């Protein structure tokens, strides 16, 4: 009966609320369901009830979640994506669509960073733009999402593609720019950044170099 009660409840909520506020309403039920399940039922049924309160409420509209998941990742919505993640992590086949689609977001945002390559400061901008992409996307995986290695592997795979970008009928531009970045930074010419900061920029260079094919 709780499968049928939340089969109609999940169908009722979507007709009134869009996917953005549908997340809070579903989590507004599971948070309350976990409380009312431990006030009445045996502790053996705590995991079986919730598994039924998500199969007929979250896994039931699996395609509805994946239809509206595109706009969530593009706008870097902190609240509408953390709630979006905790719904899919319970469903067995729901989560892998999110990590693959989020992998395309770095592969699209990363290219825009390494697109306006200036003809006078090529190596510094390429590394710094990657740290802009890497230093932000690691935060997003860690400040609203959990420390999931699936998203981390997606970010690692996506950052690999943007770094190892091959122009049509041309070699990849990654190896020389990273090679030039070190030499442009280890010289004593002009005014340096001093070894207290040189050891910091070179440490961040390893993250860019780790994705080199």
Return d(Cα 109, Cα 136) in angstroms, integer: 11
Helix (H, G, I), strand (E, B) or coil at 110: helix
List residues bridging with 166 in a β-sheet: 172
For residue 55, give the nearest of 9, 96, 12, 101 by alpha carbon: 9
CA dist 121 and 102 (Å) reads: 30
Method: cryo-EM
Q: How many CB atoms lie within 10 A of CB 72?
A: 23
Q: CA angle, corner 50, sides to 4 and 62, nearest 5?
A: 70
190 Rama class: left (phi>0) / alpha (psi -120 to 50) / beta = left
Buried-exposed string 162-175: b where 16+ CB fall within 10 A, e elsewhere = bbeeeeeeeeebbe
How many CB atoms are located within 10 Å of the residue 177 CB? 20
Please give the Cα distance from 30 to 44 (Å, whole number).
Answer: 17
- Residue pair 72/81 in contact by the 8 Å Cβ criterion: yes
Cα–Cα distance list, 176 to 120, 127, 182, 187 (Å): 14, 12, 10, 17
Do the Cβ atoms of 209 and 164 come closer than 8 Å?
Answer: no
């Amino acid at each position: 009966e709780t499968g049928e009660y939340y089969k109609q409840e999940a169908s009722n909520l979507l007709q009134e609320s869009n996917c953005s506020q549908y997340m809070e309403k579903v989590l507004g039920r599971l948070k309350d369901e976990e409380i009312r399940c431990r006030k009445y039922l045996h502790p053996s049924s705590y995991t079986k009830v919730i598994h039924e309160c998500q199969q007929r409420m979250v896994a039931d509209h699996l395609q509805f979640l994946h239809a509206e998941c595109h706009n969530i990742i593009r706008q870097e919505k902190k609240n509408d994506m953390a709630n979006m993640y905790v719904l899919l992590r319970a469903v067995s086949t729901g989560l892998p669509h999110m990590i693959q689609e989020l992998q395309n977001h770095i592969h699209d945002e990363g290219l825009r960073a390494t697109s306006n390559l200036t003809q006078e400061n090529m190596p510094t901008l390429f590394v710094e733009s990657v740290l802009e992409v890497h230093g932000k996307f690691v935060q997003l995986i860690n400040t609203v999402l959990n420390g999931d290695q699936h998203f981390m592997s997606a970010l690692d795979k996506a950052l690999t593609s943007v770094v190892n970008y091959r122009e049509p009928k041309s070699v990849c531009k990654a190896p020389e720019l990273l090679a030039k970045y070190c030499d442009n930074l280890l010289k004593k010419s002009a005014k340096g950044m001093t070894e207290n900061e040189v050891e910091d920029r070179l440490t961040s260079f390893i993250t860019v170099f780790k994705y080199i094919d």
